[model samples]
Each structure stands twice: as structure tokens, then as C-alpha cells.
Target chain A: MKVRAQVPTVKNATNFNMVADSKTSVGSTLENLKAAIAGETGAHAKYTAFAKAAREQGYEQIARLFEATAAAELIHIGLEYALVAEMEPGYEKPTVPSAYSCDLNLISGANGEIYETSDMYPAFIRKAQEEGNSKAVHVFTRAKLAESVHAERYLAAYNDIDAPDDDKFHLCPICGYIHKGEDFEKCPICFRPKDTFTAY
Target chain B: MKVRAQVPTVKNATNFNMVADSKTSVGSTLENLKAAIAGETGAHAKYTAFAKAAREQGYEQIARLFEATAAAELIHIGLEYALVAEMEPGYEKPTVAAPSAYSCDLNLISGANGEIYETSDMYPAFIRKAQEEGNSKAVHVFTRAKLAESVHAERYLAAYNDIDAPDDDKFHLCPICGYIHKGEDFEKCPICFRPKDTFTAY
Candidate 1:
């Protein structure tokens, strides 16, 4: 589908300069957040797809990992929408992406999570701070931290390969913080107690 | 990031069996909506990425197309959310999906016109059916969504037709119902009489 031809950008390849006019830097931040939201949404959907695949292959724990992480991505998306709502009221979310395969999808998940944890969210957090936006910073920061956990866990599962170990794992519902086993009584980051986690 | 594990599909490998459980197909419908929400959200994000990619690649009109369509996806997503909320009260949209580079993101926008037709004709009828079945909340959300979806289709025509879209255009949304406005907020929301100034700017 085609859209308007006058797509906006910042200057000389800088996405931050997206607004054509000068008065609204908030527009720039919103633009960034929109991109972030899309990234997270895509991540969430891919993981769900991979989870289905993992189940098909009978790697129960791996499938559970994929699903829980996918849920966290969904929550991250909600956080993005909240900020988007704060700036642009009455906003609607976009439709889901089309179909994809499983085998490569898992690698895509791992790689994507690494990029998000190491590159995307950190940069986004910095940009929101530059704009003096606190909500965005917290959302991005929590997401970034959570994504790092996602990357590590995805890698762990990948390394597990065909071992088919016990499938149970633990997920923090609040901030998307993830752990492979029952380690602490509470989440280290979001700090929700162990009793509240969804262990799969 | 210890996502514990798969929530598991039902026996015989079908998510639709979700609908098989009972008359509270509301659960199944919610399941379907979850998939829809994910799909729309993914498409929106993908189109946004495509827009940025186009902008970087120096295809201005294409970037505009991506931006407009991406925003439209958000509106569609909002409709999905409204419908989702109508059915599932405490539902929270799941974590975002992995990054993707694919065709549906673009196809959804190109198909925007067709979507208008279905939403107007079919989606509305379906909503009415739910309302008649006693789900009052669904009927209202979908009705509002149907009209807004129709509005978005025309905007799609503008984008698809190579209109004088510029990087300078600002889009706004009505918080009560998901109507998207270009620049000027009406004295009252064209759909709902929410104050114009209350419209959120993006």
C-alpha cells in the first residue's frame, strides 16, 4: 500500500531531525517512540511465532521461553503506546505483521533482541533524556534492561539446541525481566516478588 | 530475560480450538483478536521501519507513504485495541515482536481500500451481531471503529495517489474514538463531540 509521498526526516540522515519545522522537538521524540513501538511489536510477534515452532519441535521449555519473552514484548509495546497516548490521544495500534517461518525466526529473535538491548533502547533512552521526557526514559530503560535478559535467554536456549532439557522457566510480569530458574525471591530490576511471577 | 517457556497450544495443534471450548467464544474471539492485535502491531512497526529505511534510502514519497500508512496502522491497531478492550477488560497487549522485513507491512496499506469496504460492510455487521447477542460494549466500539476505518481509507487514497504530502504534515487523533485528523482539530471531534483542543497531537 502506498502512503503520502512527502515522508519527513530530520537532516542528512539523522532520524532525530524528523520534523520539517523547528518548533516541535516533541514530534521528534514521538517519532522515535513510534519507531521503538514498531520494533518491539515486531519482536513480540516473531517470538510468538518461534514459540509455536519450538512446541512443534517438542522443545517445551524453549517454546515456553519464546512465549514468555513474547508476552514481555507485548507489555513493552503497551508501555510504548501509553507514552504515545500521552502525546497523541486517541491513537490506535497498527495491525499485526504477516506470516513467517520458525527455524530462522529464532535466530532473528536472538539477533533482534541483542540489537534492541545493546543498541536500540539505550540510544532511545538517551534521546528521550535529551528531550527531558521522564516517562519515555523509564519505559525505554526498563525495556532495554528486560531485552538484555531476552537476548541472554534466547542465546541460552539456542545453545541448548536439541538437548531438550526441562522446559520450565520464570518470567516477571511487571517489567518483562526474565530468569531461567527459580533463583531469587524477587526480580532484581522491577522488584516484584517471586510469588507473582508466571513460571512456565 | 528469562521468558519462562511456551504457554502451549491445545491438543491436535490448533489455536482455533480455543473457540471450541464453549459459547463464551468471547475467549476464542479474544484469542483471535490477540492474533489480530499482534498482526496489526507488527505491520505498523514494520511499516514504520520501512518508512525510516525509505527516508534513509532517499525515497521521499515512499517514506511519506510508509509514515502515513504506519500511522494508519496505529489507528487500525487502536480499533483492534478498542475491540480487544470491549471483550477482555484486564487484557494487556503482550511484549513487542521481533524485528521484521517483509511484504505484509506494505500489502496492508495497499489493501487499505479493500479494508474500508469490509469494515463498512462486514465488520459493522459482525459488530451488530455481537451487540444483538447481548455484548453491548462490542457493538459501540466496532461502530466507532468502522466509521474511523472508513476515514482512514480515504486518507490512504491521498497517500497512494501521490498527494503533496510533506515531511511537515502533522497528524492528530481523537482520544474518545480513534479518529485521525490532519492538522486542524475540528471544533468538536467529527465523530464524537469531544473538544477539539483535547485532541492529541503527534
Candidate 2:
């Protein structure tokens, strides 16, 4: 499937709240928790994709930090899921966002994607805090801090002017996969044709 | 101090019982738990040291496995310690064995130490099972099985050519004493100053 990013309009956010606030059961609470987890997973996937992109672009330090932060976010997912399992029995959690979901062009598009730090998480924290849910607030706060760190890494990579001349600087715009040694016709992450990428 | 392979003997088994049974209060129970954790910690350290020795001798895979298993065992120690903290407060803990106390000529002398798998975790399991009064037989059995796997690896290396093949072979042999290096090659044999090549391929 050709996955397209969902741009959250102001109306979309209003609709999201109407649906979210309408339900008041434990199941609904669990569903919200699951959504929060899904959001974190999306952020984690994006960070990893960006890290690989930075590595391809020869931003080694930024890439390392991104990879480490990505792993930390994964660990957060484990902890959050553990909380969910404790709170609700037999909670069927959604799968984490895959490489295909991390379209670099979609993220860098004019209208920012849901996975971007500024777009997705603040609302998650605000909602949880408004509901006076301490667990959710705490979890979201931790993720927010991680997202800030991820943002700093991206800024560093984007602004680095003295990045060494190397053949590894090109990345797959669709999946953020790095091309090493030589260019390929396809990206390993999303199997997108290589012609879709711009220079790092 | 010279290092020696202090294999778990019947005497050590008796000592474990004496220490665990002598304590009666919650403090003592906590102490016993800490001792169990320490035993696991010791196992982790030993396996790590053994893995490093194997790596030195060029037994890369075995060394890597030992290192990985040692890390797993350390996690087990942390889990057990957490349990102990939760269950028993004011518990006296066992002392971590010093390098000097565990120092043995065997570990120091041969690049391929004869102590492989002799640190049988069987007694530790038995102690935990008896003390906890629950069927921890599964954990005990699994650990014993893992130890046996290590033993099997050692036996296989012994039967092969000189443990050190100088190549990608998983085992190595000490050039001086002709002992199979189950882990890795060391620069100078603690036993003999012979170069690594004197050891034939396993």
C-alpha cells in the first residue's frame, strides 16, 4: 500500500477529542493508554529512521545519539505496556510503527506528520494531565523529554556544515535507510525505488 | 597471591548448609538470600573471567557465549536481590568474594583452565529450593543443564585437535601444557612462556 501521512487539521483534533471524551469505561481508558503507547512507538520509529538517515549523511555523533535514544524509547514502550497489562487484563496492544510508516518525505512535508515531536505528544500529555491521570502524565512527560533530545539530534545533523565528503551521505527519503559504499536501486527499509531520495 | 581452581566440593556444600541453617530470624533469612545472590554473582564473575581467558586464547564464540551467559546470570542476581529486599528487611548480606580469596594457580597458570563447568550451580539451586520451601526444581534443573552444556563444550574441545587452531576454530590449546583453551588465547602462557603457535590446532 502507498502509505500517506495523515495531516492533523484543527478540525481533526476537535473530532479526536469528541470521540476520545465520549467514552468513560475502563475499556476506553485502556484504549487511550494504548493510543499513547502507539504515539510513543511512532516517535520511536521516527527517531530510529532519522538516526539511520544521519548515519548515511555522515553525522556519526547525531546518529549515535539518535540510535541510543531510539533504544531508550523502545524500553519506554516496554515499561508502558507493562503498566497497561497491570491496569487492564488481556489488553490487545497495537504493533509498533514499522519502517514503512516512517516516510521521510511525508515527515518533512509542508504539513508536519503526526510522528513529529511538536505535533503528537504535547496534546497527549495535556489530555492525560487534564484527566488527572498521574501514570499517563508521568509516562508522557518522560516521552516528551526523550522527544526533545531527539529534536536536538536532528537540529545538529541538519545544521552541520563541515560534514566530511563521503559517498555515504545519501539516504532513502521514503524509509531513512542509509546507502553505504555504493548507491542501490531500492531502499532496505521500505523497498522504495532509490530515485526517490534527495542528497543528504 | 597465586590463583587456584576452587571447585565446589562436598565441603563447600556442607558450609552452605551450615551458614543458611544457623540463621533463624528475618535477618538471617535475608542474609541467606544475599548469600545466594552472591553465589550467582560469583558465577557471573567466574564466567566473565573464563570468557576473557577464552577470548585471549582466540575461542571467540565460546568466549562470547560465556560473556553473554555471565551477563544473564548477573541479571538473575539483580532479580533475586530485589526479591530479597522485598521479602526480608534487616537481612545481613554475604560478602562478595575478593579476587585474592578466589586466587588460584590453575586460573593463572593455564590459558586453558581445567576448571571449566566444575563450578556446578547444582548446590546453589538445591539450597534455594530447600530454603524457599517451594519447587524451584525447574530453575535448578535448567541451570544444571546449562552447566552441563558448558561441560559438553569442554569435552568436545578436548577431543578435537589442539584447542588453539590460530584460526576461527571455536576452541584453543595452550602451547606449553597442551591443555585445550576453551575460551581464547593469552599473550604469554601462565604455565609456560611459549608463543601461541606452539599450541597445535584443536
Candidate 3:
């Protein structure tokens, strides 16, 4: 049986009572968040290795792309962890992330992006929605949309993985929009510009 | 808000029920389990540092004791995750533990053990709490945590027995032979013939 909250969204300072701590419901969501943390840490570790492979084989340019996006995975760690901590104060993290050479950057890279766009983020958003995680839904939605653009960027790179002089790249830094330039003072994605863009 | 189920711990189950499919009360304990994971990670980190200090001081035996306990902290990252995974099918992990130095390690052990008993009981009750409320995943999370705790508490207790001896503040090592001793006695080293003051600290 599904149940909604008292006022939908409360109007208090803490806004603490958004959803009843229905141990069963929240419990399942926490389970999900743990698995999510596991997968995310795994990807971060995987992408890290993928970048190293890129660097060693004379694909320094490709390595740069794998590089920033690898760090991007850390965003989810603190997030799910913070959520876990907030809910289960006695929780202990026992597992360590494992990674391998899912080598050959862009093909896998672009494919992974599409995986998130097509499978990963959509599934996460749907589950988050089921648990009534309105906030997470927004985050996943943004991520899903961004992953679309991310896949496109990876594909473009794969089309010409070797040509460097003509292809300089900059990211919005705020939202992880894989930018192809041709912009002004503001980021079309997250509304930031020039100040934080890293040219490579 | 809370869901309870009468299902047995379904066997042959990599294919556990997803959270969305369960509409009763898993929502309740997920919050509790998340809070618990945060704390467990915190303690894991704390004990990890503790184990390192012991190793760095060359107290390898004590380090082993701490290391076992350190490892014991991690069983829960995913009882929640498996169900979390069954529900979500995606997860990630890294950086399991940490711990630090303190004035008296034994006293900290005592206090932490006490905290364990104080807080650990909540899970079993939560197990039933979730079971009664009928959120299978919540029951599973707490059950997973609860069972792991049962094993670890005994291990921690074993670790306690392993380390719960009278430790004199004094320790000395033979300068030449590397023989170690841990008390104040008025004699030369049996192996190296060094005077008490000549011995290095263990």
C-alpha cells in the first residue's frame, strides 16, 4: 500500500518530516543506495584504469577525457554515503572498489555513457521515484540528460580518436556537461563560463 | 509508510524482490540502515587508523588483532546493497575503513565494546520491527547487519580476549639480539647482556 505525506512538502525550518521513516520502505532504498555506491566506485576505479591505459599507449588526449570523467564518479560516493550515514548512523563500510582495464577508451567510454543514459540513470531515477525521493529524481534526471550529451561527446571523440590540433575541449565544471564550445559568457548547460573551463 | 511480509528468507535468491515492488514498509528501515552504514563506515575508518598505528609501532601482534577487528566492520556495506542491488541493480564501493590513535587504546576498546552492546541490540529488534511491519528488505538489512554483528561481536570479543592482558607501561628490547621484554627488572638482557637502560623500546 502506498502512502503520501502530511502536507506533500512541509513548510518548516527543518523540513525533516518529508516522508515517514517507514523502516521497510527506506530500508529498501538504502539497500539500493549501497549497490549504487558500489557500482559508482567501481566505475570510478574502472575509468581510472582506462585513463592509465590511454596514457601508456600514446593516447594522451583520450586519457585527458577519461581523466576528468573518472573524478566525476566521486560525486556519487559522498552522496550515497552521506545519505547512508544520515539514515544508519552505525553503518560500517567494509567493501573496497575493484577496477580493471576495460581498456580501449572511447568505444567503452561512449558505450558506458549510453549505458547510463539508457539504463543506469533511468533505473536509478525510477527507483528513487518509487521511494518518493523527489530530490534524487531531480539529480538523476539531470544526470540522465547530461549522459545523453556525454555519450555524444564520447562518440565525436571516437570518430577521430587520434586528431588533436582541431579538437580542444572544455567542460562546464558545474554540471558535467561535456561541452564542444561555441558559446558566450554563460554555460548553456549549468550557466557557468570561462572561469572554470579546463582546455585540453 | 511501513511494509511487512511473511516470506521466508527466500533461498536461491540473487533475484530478491525489488523495493518498488514492495509497497508496505521497507521505507522505514531504509532510513535507519543508511544511518547505520554511515556510522559503521565512520568506526571502520577509526579502527583502520588504529590498526595502522599498532603496525607502525611494530606491534605486529596487536596490529593483527586490530586488523581482524577492522575487517570485521565491513559485512554490512551491502546486505542493504544486495537488496539495494536487487532493487537498483547498480552499486559502487571503495575506501572501507579508518581509525586513529588515542591516549589509552585499551580504554577505547572498552568504551567501543560498550557502545557495541548499547547500539547493536537495535538491529535484531529492528529485524522484528521490519518483519512485523512487513518490509522484507528492511528485515533483510537489519538481519544481515544483525547476523554480521553476532559474528563480529564474538570476533571482537575474541580480539578482546586476545588483547585483554595486563600491559605494563614498560617495554624493552635487547640491543644486540633483538630479544624483546615488557617489564622493569634489574638485570642485563639474557641474550645480549645489555643493561636495562641500554635496551631499546619495544
Candidate 4:
């Protein structure tokens, strides 16, 4: 199997920068959106691997969670792409970190989620706010909210890794929120009606 | 660095068959559509990596070509996703083959080779299977995707031979079938009949 290299932080990555000059601070909404696209693509790829690993470890529900999150990441990716279409910032694939044991993958996934919620998305949201880019702000805000939910879900899953529950995850097709059950009435993050949620 | 394992021939791959039961020989259009989604997603991811490598090797135009093709791949991905949304085939990322070479010239050739496979073999098989299944949607999607890939293969080969010249090449992508037109000479997409104004400029 081809193992993926650890992805470098998008902030100061050696390659995959959209601009000709990489030394400058990320200056525009388009740039930030592109970075998010790259980041989410990495996450999508990582979560897919993590899902297979989870299944291999006999944690079927954990695998389902990872698969749902991977799908959610594409929602994020596609939304950002729509917003950045006019800018046409060329795409370059980011490296996906290799998946470890299911336990480690959960912890690592949770930490990445926390970083996005606490650091990356907040910064992007603020920059979009400053730039008066409401569309950019909208996409960033939605992703940040969803990432926090993902962090909580990941940490909770980590806590129960010893005897994983066979919980079904239902994702809000609009905003990437992975609701833990089919009984939910609304997406707590995107407020989309439960009717639109896709069950995993 | 984690290296990608060589992808087994997708037709008999243990994973990524889309349907719950893998023993069926590409029966439904939905199955074929889902397979296209997985395949295009793989292509999208691979070309993105190829684009980065191309840029690193200072093949700017080639890099642009790769990037444009990556974007085009997403069009195929998005279209398939839209088609498959009603069926809701759970998304699973397929194993992407590792980049064959970091050298831009070799990368271009590698990309061309993959496109050729899709155009000549993969899409044709899918289209025929969809036809046998009597699914117009799958037949339409597969046929157009095959047409676009052929153009991509031709473009990649052309760029590989030239390697240098116009740095300001513009790409316009037809949202319908992901056909990417280089230069502004054409009024209608060769593959899809959508008006030129409908094409997204990249």
C-alpha cells in the first residue's frame, strides 16, 4: 500500500501554495478558501483511510463515523470550491497523513478537529470578516461549527474505543454536521431539517 | 513518506465496488455511476498531486494543464455525485496510484496514459454495461466522460511534446461533461452542446 506522508501545516507549507510568492501572509479570502480546500481534502483522504482501519479493528461504528466525516469533508471541499470558483485559484493536492491504530487515529482526528475549530477556521472567519466577504465568512463559519461537533464526536468516540457502540451517523447534506442518530429532528449546526440528512 | 500501493485493476478490486454485493458484474447504472464517482475522485486527487509536482519542476503551463484537468475531474465527480445522490452510495475513497514520476515530462506522459485508459477502456466498458442495463442516465454520463478524457489525453500528449511556448494558456471547462477547451476559438463545447458562455473559465 502507498502510505501517505504527513501533511505540512497549510500556513507555511513548502509546496501547494496558490500564489507565486509563498513568503507573504495569507492575504485574501480566495487564498484562505483555497487553503481550507486543501486542508479538507487532506482530511477527507485521511478519514477514508482511518475508516478502513477502524473496520479492520472491528469497530464498525467508528468506521461509519469516519466514513460519514469523510463525506462531510467533501461537503466542505465542494462548498469552498463553489465560493472560490471565480478566483480560480489552481488546486494542488496536499499530503494525507498515514492512519495508525484505531485508537491513535481517533485521538489524532480529534486533535485536528480541535485545531480547525479553535485556530484555523476562527482565523479564516475573522479574515473573511475583515475583508467583508460574507460568502467566504458563511462557508468558513459553517465549517468551523461543524468541526467543533466533529471534535466532540471524535473525543467521545475515543472515550469509548474499548467497546465501540454501533451508532449510526446521519450527516446534514447542507452543512456537514454528523448527527449521531436518526432520531434527531434538526441539524444542530446547520439547522437543516432532518429530512435532508443522509444516514451512514 | 507514505507511499500509495499499486491499485489493483478496479474491475476486480476487493474494495470500491460501490454496491453492497461485489459479485455482480456491473449490473445497474447506479453501480456504474458510483464507480465513476470513485474513479473520478481518484483521478481528481491524483492530478492535483501531479499539478503540484509539475509546478515544483518549473513546468508552469504543464502545471496549469494539470490543475485545469484536476478541476475538470471534479466536474465529472460533481456530476456523478449529483446523479448518485438520489441513490446515496456511501462515499469511499478509492486507492490512488502513486505519482509515476516527479519529472514534469514523465508526469505528463503518465497523466496521458491514465486518460487514455479511461477513454479507451474504462468508460467504454461502463457505457456498454449501462446500455445493457438500459439506463440512459449512466450511458449519458459515461459517454460524455469518455469524450472528455480523450481530449485530455490528446492535450497532455501535445503539451508533453511542446513543453514550452505559451505561458498564458486559458482553460474553459464545460460544467455539463467536464470538457476543457484550450484557447477561445470554439463557440460550442465539442462534447456538450452547452453554450460557450456557460463554460467556467479557469
Candidate 5:
């Protein structure tokens, strides 16, 4: 049975209503969070596989970028999971993606981020606000901002897939944002202090 | 850079030959184990989500099965990581899977397909490579994981077939070897031979 909303290519402002609105207030936010957890968990795994592929092809910097992004996704999973545990434990079933090539992986990954940032998270955040679940709103906002950054990074990487130069990457623990290069003092998305960032 | 062997649905005898014939024997095995680690990690996370979905849908037994299997996947991941850590200390990257838009019943099908692939094709090739290299740790973990995946494949198929009429059955999991025992009691883990007292209930 197709219980959840399909990943939409266009703006899906009303998609949340299909999956979450008929339930109670808690159900709305909780369902959205659980879905987010599933997506983030899957992204974490896919990026890991892509990282190995990048390493094999000698795209050292791109590999680190994938590693940093994977770490960020894992952090997002943990954050959403903590919220879910406060309510109830959760699954959105994940499939192993068919392709492992670096370019294909980047394209798939970029599209996912574009969907989440533009459609999924916006609807989720709106739902959270409607239910007055301030915590969900905060978490979704963080994820949305971080995902926008991820989409941009993935698109840039896809365009410059041939660049042999490797740059250092730093991760923000708060919102799963990967900052390329060591010049940034604080996370542009989460505003976390520089020392808190993990380098890759 | 496609570093790992392609996961072949048809017989992968030739694929295993390519990996085994590589110059760096341990390197090939290490990449395989890392890929396995990535796969198992994603499985663990996905099953965690599936457990929640099962509980919400009122399939308590199915929920337990998912949880037990997730625990089993965790053990496989930890064991593989232990071997990899021993081989290369500087190495530090982990792996995950894609989420489905399907219902719990279809989710079971997906889960079963994944387990069947691991048990039949993926693990056999991995185990063959490890055995060829005489990498005891790799062989042990890969063999044990293959056994557990077979159990999961069977359990998931049963659940998929009878998803509409789930029973309230308790599940006991072996921590050491990831073997899951359905029902009340068992003397020892059939895979690891650990005592029943060491089993965890879900």
C-alpha cells in the first residue's frame, strides 16, 4: 500500500494534509518527524556509499565532502529521533539506491535535498507551527536550512566533478551543515562556534 | 571511482574473481567489509523506522520482529567495524539506505528482498573472498551475518504473507550472534551456542 506521499518534483504545499492532517495534533508533528527521520537515515547511508566511490575514483576532496554530509545527516537523524522518543518511537522504509557512480549519486542526492528544502520541510514546519509544537518547528527549521546548504553543495560538486584539488571540510554539530574550507569562523546555518565543528 | 564490486543479482562468481584477483588482497576485503558495514548500518536504521511503522499500524508482533532484526544488524555492524579497525586504524567513515514510500506490507517485501540478496548473493561472495584470503575475522563475521540474514529473510517473508493477520508472539534475540528465537524459551542460541539467559526479549 502507498501510505505516504510520493516525493514530489513540484512544490507540494498540501502533501502533509494527505499523510498527517487527519490525525490528532500530536500525530501531525510526530508523523512528520518520523518521516524526516527515515529520509535523513537513508541519506546518511547513501552518502557513505558515495564517499567510498569518490575515494576509489581519487576525488579525495569530494569524498570528504560526502563524509561530512553523511555525518551531518546522522546528526539530523539523532535530533529527530530524540524528538520522536519524547513522543513515541518510529519507520519510513528505505531502499538501497541502484546506482553507485559519483555523478549519479550526486544528482540523486541533490534532487532529494531540493525536495526536502523546498517542499517537505516547509510543509512540515508549517504543520508544526499550526499545532503549536514549537520544538518540531525549531527542528524542522534547522533541517530545512541545512538541507538547502546540502543541495547547493551537491549541485556545485556535480558541476565540478573533475576538480582534483581537495579542500578541508568542517561540520556543525547543531544542524548537520558541512562548511567547505577552513576560513569560516562559525556555521552560516546554525551559527555554532568554530571550535565545535568537526573537521574532515 | 567505483571502488567496490557491483552487487550482482545474477550469479556473481566472476565478480568475486575480479575482487580476489586484485593486487591488494586485504584492500579488496576491507572495501567489501566497509560496503557491508554501510549496508548493515542502513538496514539497522531502516528497520528502526519499520518497527515504528509496525507499531503504529497495530502489528505488535511484526514490530518486535523488526526490532529484533535491527538489533541483529547492529551486532553485524559492530563486529565488522572491529575487524576494519584492526586492519586500518586511521580509517574513519561509516555508511546508510534510501527510504520507501510504501506501506508496512510492502515494506516487508522490500526488507525481505534486501535480506535475500545479502544471504544468497552478497554474503556468499564476501565469505568466499574472506575464506580465500584466510581472513579469520572477516570469515567469522561474514558467515555469522549470512546466517542471521537467512533467518531475517524467512521471518520477513512469513510476515509479508500473513501481514493482515499478525499474531502476538514474543521474540528473543541472541546478542553475540544476532540469531532470533521466536516464542517463549530456548536453551541456547543455535548460531552462537550462548545460553538462553543471555538472550534479549523484544
Candidate 6:
């Protein structure tokens, strides 16, 4: 199986710094929002593809979830776009880590990096809440809540199978990451490489 | 918010037919097994990544499941590889639809078109269970079984929740596709433009 090598922490740290620096610009904030929307759209496309594939293959439930998840992502994109469009002139842009930096760290599998909403967004939200920036806080809170929902859905899918005493899950095909106790090299669905596998 | 125009049945049907005609020989059964192993390895890696991401993001349960599923996929790969390595020379290759063909028809939403098992091992198992050659019953049963397992896993994931709600039993749905919301909006459904509100708890 093909495996991408692990990224060094120094490089990741550098990228993180770059991301932090880029967020100072108001324009960057809007760009980030656009980027996020794009990312969500990509995810939506992926899930839709998966759903279509599942239905064709006669895996109706899997198809349904993929279809549903894709739909949800669309809503998120729409809401975010609306929020961005309503921004007032001279509004201070919220600082966020650059997408490039964030993605670099994510792809590198950097440990303890704060990227997800719970880890990173809460800090921003707290600051916004303290400053009485209701809009910012509200938006961040909603994003955080949505992330939690996504996580739960993933967990439920994972737990549905009666895990065999000795069975080990394999790496996801799309991301090339592994689940723990899974004995396979590639995920039956995604076809990821073995080296991408990590222990839970 | 970017929606791709849905290509209705006519477009989809043509795509499917094109895929079917382009099918390649299954290759050696051993090769088929190796491919399946590779596919499983990919899944293992993805799950592991998800688990790590969840942990970093402070999602404990999700992290655990990601770890568990990754491990399971790994085991499957090993077993499949071993089965392939043990295949006798001159083994007949199973004639199954190509990935593209299957994918085109499967809708690509729920991972249905992907290879579910290593043909090298799975085919033998099918033969053994049927105790007869060329029996459609065995083929149908195994395929359906695999599909059922895939569906169950999909639903479980869709219904998973991590937060406590006031009602405890109340759930949210996506308006377009009817996917139950667990807690987050990691990704959206491609076919529909709805979010968690589209889903409703049973």
C-alpha cells in the first residue's frame, strides 16, 4: 500500500506561524470563509459520490447517510455564506489560522494541534462572548455544535458493526488513515494506504 | 451552497453502460486479493487519522471508534493477503463488475460501489457455503450479506450522538436527504442542500 511519509513538526510549526500571520488582514477573513465553503462543497461532493456508489451497489443505508451528510454540508455552506455577505463595512475580521497552514498540519498528522472547532473555535468564541460580539460568538458556537454532530454520526457508523474479538479495522481509502484494532491494510471502502493508519 | 446540477437517469444510465463495457479482466485471483488488501489498508489509515483528529479535537468517543475501525480494516487486509498468497496456481479469477462500473451505478454516496471483500478468499468461501458450482444462490446470499453489513454500519454512524439534549430522545435531520444529525456537520450530503434540520429522529 502507498503511504505518505510523516511531516516533520518544525515544518508544521512554521506553517502554523504563517497561518497565524495571514489572518491579521480583513480580506483574509473573507477569503478563509470562502475557502471553508469550498472545502465543505468538496466534502459534499465526495459524500454524494459515495452515496450514489452505495445505492448502485445495493448498500441503501450507506447511501442514505452519504446523501444526508452531503445535504447537511450544503446547509452549512449556505448559512456561512449568508453570514459573510451580511458583514458591515469597517468590521474587524476575525483572526483564524490560514487554511494552508491548517491543512498542512492536518495532512501531516501533527499531534495536539488545535484545528477542530472544539479545540480552536471555543477560544475565539469565548473572546467574542467576552467582548459582546454576539454575531461572532453565535456563528462560532453553531459551527462548533455542527462539528460535534458530525463526530457523533461517524461514531455511530463505526459502532454499528459487532466487532469481532480479533478483527482489526483498516485505513480509510480516501485519507490513508487507519483505525485501531483493524487488521487490514486498506479500507474496503476508501482504499487508503497502511502507513496512514494511526492507533486510536 | 454550490450545488452540482443533477444528471438525471438518462445521463446516469449512459455512464453506467459505458463503465460496464470498459470492464477489464479480473486479473489473477491472487492479484484481486492483493488489491482488496490494499483497499483495506487505505481504510485503516483513514480511520486512524480520524481517531487522531477526534482526539485532538476532544471528541473522545469518535476517537475511539476511529481507532477501532482502523484496526478492524487492518485485520481484514492481513487475512485477505494471506488468502491470496495461498491461492493455488491456475486459480480461476472471479468475474465481477469493475470498480468504475459499480461506482457509477451505486451513486457514490455511501461507499456501496467499493470492493467489500477480497475475491480470492471470498469466492472460495462462497463456493464452500453453497457446496455446489455455479449456484446463483450463494452469490446472491454473499453479496446481500455484505451489503447488509455495510448498510448497518452506515446507519449506526448516521445516528451517533455525543451531546446530551434536553429531550434526550429528540434528534435532528437534514431537510434534503433525511440523514440524522449526531452532533456535528463535518460534511454535507451532496444530493441535498439541507443541514441537520433535514433529519428527524425516529
Q: Provide the TM-score for each candidate, comma-separated.
A: 0.43, 0.29, 0.38, 0.43, 0.44, 0.33
Can you give the lDDT of residue B84 in candidate 4?
Answer: 79
* Of candidates 3 and 2, the better by TM-score: 3
Candidate 6 second chain TM = 0.41
Better of 3 and 6 by DockQ: 6
Candidates sorted by lDDT, best first: 5, 4, 1, 3, 2, 6
* Per-residue lDDT over B35-124 for candidate 4, one digit per residue giving the tens place of the 0 to 100 score: 777778778877888888877887777777888899888888777777777667565535566544456644664566567556545666
User: Candidate 1 — which residues are off by over 4 angstroms?
Assistant: A1-27, A97-103, B1-202
TM-score for candidate 2 (chain B): 0.41
For A1-200, candidate 4 gives per-residue lDDT tens digits of 00113211222221111212222245689889988888899999989999999899778998999999999999999889888885675555355457776745765676566556545776787688789888887788778767756755664464344434556899988887887765677765556678888888
Worst 10 residues of 6 chain B by lDDT: B101-110
Name the regions of candidate 3 deviating beyond 4 angstroms: A1-27, A90-103, A166-168, A180-189, A197-200, B1-202
Which lDDT tens digits does candidate 6 get at residues A1-200? 11113221212111111122122222234454555556556656655665666556544554454555556556556655665677534433222211221111111111111132224434445555556657554554444344333433333332231121332333232222224344455532224456654332
Error of 3 at B185 (Å): 90
What ranking of all candidate models by DockQ puts the best one first? 6, 1, 5, 4, 3, 2
lDDT of 6 by residue, B4-85 (tens): 3431121221111111122233444445455545556665554556556555655455455445444545545544544554
| TM-score of model number 1 | 0.43
* Distance from true location, Cα of A98 in model 1, Å: 7.7
Query: Could you tell me the lDDT of residue A167 within candidate 2?
Result: 43
How many residue pairs clash in all the candidates, one count each?
Answer: 54, 22, 69, 7, 8, 113
Docking class of 4: incorrect
Tens digits of per-residue lDDT for model 3, A37-79:
6766776776678778767766676677766666555654555
User: TM-score ranking from best to worst?
Assistant: 5, 4, 1, 3, 6, 2
Candidate 2 stretches greater than 4 Å from native: A1-29, A53-58, A96-119, A164-200, B1-202
TM-score of A-chain in each prediction? 0.80, 0.50, 0.69, 0.83, 0.81, 0.46
Q: Report clash pairs, candidate 5.
A: A45-B96, A57-B1, A90-B52, A91-B49, A93-B100, A94-B98, A94-B99, A95-B98
Lowest summed lDDT window (length 10), candidate 3 chain B: B1-10
Scanning candidate 5 chain B in windows of ten residues, the lowest lDDT window is B1-10
Candidate 1 lDDT, B106-143, residue by residue in tens = 32233342334333344444454555466555545445
